[PDB]
Symmetry: C5
Subunit: 337 residues, 5 copies
């Protein structure tokens, strides 16, 4: 009668667990059990471009109804100890694209079981998962990624279980509080659907983030040095061929600086082995400075033979190099932006 009688509550719980078979899902052999899901994103730790995965920490909550656990005489929600979850049936929900996930267990396992008078069960966990995400890095470092978290029942088909987001589009909270330095979250989407494998149908939930990479750091750290080196190489064009030490020194310095910058950036860039926009841009700048040095060498060679042709070639190079470089850069930016 009185809710304060802990012996009465113990009797009720023992009656609920009396003859309770954890091997059988609720409504076994009947209608599928509907499971609602909530995700409270604590934070996103890292977004690894090298491994193409991201670490996500979240409060994952599942909401279902098992009439076997329905009780009476206690007008309260029984917030039981987490250990009782080992004595109850819980959905075999897993993440399709995770690689290494775990449940935090300090001080105790971060697990919560709440029972309601109508038999409703709420089961909460705190989970850190490293979810894989295939990244299209052709547009790097101006790409926009779409990283997904897929949630699926491992063993129960759609005839036995039906996932759905609990709360419409509000099923996932805390996205706006995510503090990602390198990336910025633009839009998150919730999808509920079914899939069909050789063993039958399966429910599926999907949480998708669209990450827009910040561009200021890359512009201020990778493109401007190469542009400055190209302009410095062009500086040697406007020095007379009477003395060769100045122009040779300028060309050598430009080549060495460009090579060292390329190597240094490659040592602080993702090691994914395929072509990127930044690599093409740097290689184009390298080709431009190499062509400038070639033209200076040819002019120096022919100066002792044909001064008039040397002057004409120098003037035409002064005409061609800047406009050609600007055309190349503008078409590159239009192609990528």
């Amino acid at each position: 009668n009185d809710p304060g009688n802990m012996s009465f509550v113990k009797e009720t719980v023992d009656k609920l667990l009396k003859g309770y078979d954890i091997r059988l899902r609720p409504d076994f052999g009947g209608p599928p059990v509907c499971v609602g899901m909530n995700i409270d994103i604590a934070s996103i730790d890292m977004v690894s471009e090298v491994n193409m995965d991201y670490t996500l920490t979240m409060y994952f909550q599942q909401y279902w109804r098992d009439k076997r656990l329905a009780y009476s005489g206690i007008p309260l929600n029984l917030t039981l100890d987490n250990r009782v979850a080992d004595q109850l049936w819980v959905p075999d929900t897993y993440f399709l694209n995770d690689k290494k996930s775990f449940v935090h267990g300090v001080t105790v396992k971060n697990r919560m079981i709440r029972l309601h008078p109508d038999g409703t069960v709420l089961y909460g966990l705190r989970i850190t998962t490293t979810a894989a995400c295939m990244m299209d890095l052709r547009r790097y470092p101006l790409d926009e990624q779409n990283c997904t978290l897929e949630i699926e029942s491992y063993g129960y088909t759609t005839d036995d279980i039906e996932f759905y987001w609990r709360g419409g589009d509000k099923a996932v909270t805390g996205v706006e509080r995510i503090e990602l330095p390198q990336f910025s979250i633009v839009e998150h989407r919730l999808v509920s659907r079914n899939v069909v494998f050789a063993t039958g149908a399966y429910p599926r939930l999907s949480l998708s983030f669209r990450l827009k990479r910040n561009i200021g750091y890359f512009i201020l750290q990778t493109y401007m040095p190469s542009i400055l080196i190209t302009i410095l190489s062009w500086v040697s064009f406007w020095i007379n061929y009477d003395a060769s030490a100045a122009r040779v020194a300028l060309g050598i310095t430009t080549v060495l600086t460009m090579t060292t910058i390329n190597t240094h950036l490659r040592e602080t860039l993702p090691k994914i082995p395929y072509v990127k926009a930044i690599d093409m841009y740097l290689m184009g700048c390298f080709v431009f400075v190499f062509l400038a040095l070639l033209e200076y060498a040819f002019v120096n060679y022919i100066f002792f033979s044909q001064p008039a042709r040397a002057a004409a070639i120098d003037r035409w190079s002064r005409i061609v190099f800047p406009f050609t470089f600007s055309l190349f850069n503008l078409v590159y930016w239009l192609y990528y932006v």
Copy 2:
């Protein structure tokens, strides 16, 4: 009845544990159980800006009152084996902002259970937690950080549990004994409050450390070599332009060495979106040495056509550049201090 009669003590313990339902909190269905907490910090192992987290080892102790475990006739504090914690109810206290924490287990699980005659239980653990601490590296390496550890009940709301520091501001000890190689703990604070989530009000305790970095390592590591390289670049001014090869070689060598040093230091430093103060200083030094190189090239360009103007430019620069660098350093050390 005597303590020497270990059979009597065993019978008392067995009677305490008989009919003890671990799935219900003390005073279940009634007022919340007040839980006091003590933290005895052993050491802060590391504070990493790459992962933006700090590793902390501590003794975490929880004091609470459980009338079910009250015993009479034995006026002694019963220090039981840690395994008895598997037969007792314990709070589901967890850390809000950790990433990978564990309880040490050599030679046994570092766990302590102490019962008291009035029915009060003390439960102690030794926990090494890697708590995530978002850092504002804007003023690096002259930054001041504030790293917090949050303690919260996972399942039970404020109606079922309440937290408080046991000892006021003296609850957390061992802070002054912490030996951080690269930081100094200016202050620590203790906060007790209640937060609100969709499932209700939850108790919350906060332990905050304000850290200040030590500048000596970076002063003797990055700043002084850069200043020395800048002075070496200046040295070329005091060489006559008749032997231009020596000055050109010195300028090229200084530029290449400064670039290599800056690239290596950048490789050592982590990756953040904005620009660190150390990066700004290195950029300024490289700008100064590059401008010195370009100024010498400009002078040597018209060295013979207008020798008087070249000599005047060199004599002006020999005073202008040190004054400009001193002004830049004054602005730098005034803005960040």
Copy 3:
């Protein structure tokens, strides 16, 4: 009586598990039990030549028949909770060449047990296995690797268990969706056989992939700088010996640059006991630039004595060096392709 009667299903399951011995294989002492295996490869996480291993995430399903588990009266397939797998006999199937393999356990253990009216048992796991694939890196980065996953029975010989691929060549799915940055899957094969060891004959199932390495990344990042530096070294032949000092620098620069590139590529692959194709190409480029510098030094040695021979040597080199390098590139790209 009713198919949806949970009590009836519980009684049937209890009778199935009552008197069931988990220490004895089905039809113990009789004909061997046949196990049919399906593999659904979700993704290949990474392939590493440093450790010579590949990470594989898959759904591994085993099919067998245990007449002790046959039940009647329920015309449905029982999808039991994964925790029932501990109460049944499961094959001792392991992977012969795995290093660190584990079964995912979030939120629950990624395990599925399905019983059928005729005693048929389907047992599915989600396994992330780091399989050791010995690699031949002689042709690297133009290599074509053959990586296999071996499946064997540990304790039971061919007299107690037999393996076959359920579904023939369609047993292993998901290969078409595998996305590898550095590799492209060419073909996958399934092999079933028996292997003889000192303890008897054991079943063996081999799943082999042939992987082909993409070459665009290495062409853009490694070969192009080498070719450009070699051409820059050639440039010196078009400069008269009157700038003998400056020419030195140019030649020096190339070698210096080459050395830097070599360092950039030094920490890329482990210590193979032979010569990789990329290392051979870099050695060839270094030899070419070194020989160009030696030729210039020889020219400078006799420049004062026999200038006509010096000019003749320069003219000969202008044709020999590009021709020899083109011949070397032709033979290299014919040998490795």
Copy 4:
């Protein structure tokens, strides 16, 4: 009565464990139980100054007495399976300053339980632990570190348990067999004491090692190249100002080599706020070579008008610079070595 009656031995053991309570220490409520501890060190895997900790593998053995486990009629010592250790009370011994530790469990858990007729229990555990050792590197690489392993009971106070080294100073063996490539173990000390916390008094056993670093590697790695380069830098003084190219080359090469040595030193190093001995030495060498180059530049600036001034400066420097550098080296070695 027959020892070979394995059924009789099983019955005796079951009777010993019948009604046995693992939640109560031996002689609960009476005198504190005395635990004698032995340690057999197998190897110190590594000592890292980056994390300031050392990895240690040992054979931590404990010795106590529990009259509840006293058996009669069998004049033998019962070496039981390790699993029976889960059925007996064991001290809550832990290491005060360990970060990661574990008990090896291949092929079985490396755990040993031996029972004696009087009720005495011997409990062996093969343990690998990474113990944190705070290091003062202000004298690196001449430093002599002191790394301690602490052992303490967790829950029981001194009123419930007491710790003592079994065998006196010979409790810990195998220290001489440790061969650290970098350090050398000068001495090991054993301390038994009691500490006080807000929860009462606790026993404490300290095993301390004094590690003396070997300077042989560093001298032939860092000090010698810097000394050689600084001595080489004096050659620029002997060569007259007329051959300016060679002097410029010597100055540039000395500066570049010193800078590269400094960068390599900073490559293999942890982060500390103070100044280490080798760091100060490299800073001094760099200052000396930089001053030599600056002096040469000044001479080249003024030699165009006063060749006698340049000659006098060179002659004075050829004595001042070596004398100053030797004085700096001598004072450095006096300040650090002794």
Copy 5:
């Protein structure tokens, strides 16, 4: 009562485990129980000089006799489930020199229990271990290490347990199939003896391998570039002395390149007190490329005094330096053989 009757075999197995005490070794209080051992080495994953340890995967089989498990009427070798190993007595065999080892547990724990009519028990495991191996790196990389694996009884003395190699020198197989990229296994040895500790005599088995390293990788990696840089230093001798800029640039570049190579090589191995062969050779190469610069400076010092003597000593240097360097290489490669 045929062997195919699973009920009879279950009864026999239950009878064997009826009253079996896992806390007592076979023949307790009597003669020691012999335990033969077999090792089937699958692979040696790595041999790292950084940590002075090597990884090893092997099938470890222990073969002994337990008369309490003797059964009759079933003329078959009972291959039981792996979990039955938790209900038997197994030796406490451990590895003396291992650092961290484990038994693979996918899909089940790799563990085989086989019983024979005469009570003989065969117990097999698949173990991956990290065995410590102190390496004498004085002659790196021309060294020849001897790495051992020690097998011992943790608790039982020679009075209770006597180890031996089952099958003599054939007790270890799979040695000839070991694939080490950097090492070649010259020989392996098996030793059986007894070792006296404070608690008495313990049986001991030793499995030793002698590994010889391969030199081609280091010949192509470091020695060849060092020799090339030494010849590059030699280049400056075959040049007219008046070309100060060329020789200065050559000397500076050679010194910088040699120092860069040495620095990029120093990080391979930890701070071993002794000096490796590589270190001695690199120091010698640096000495030669430094004496080249010193000789050039010495010539430039007496350039004004006796230019004829300058040319003569330049020719003598041309004669000497290659000969002295050849002598150095000859003695170096003769000592390390």
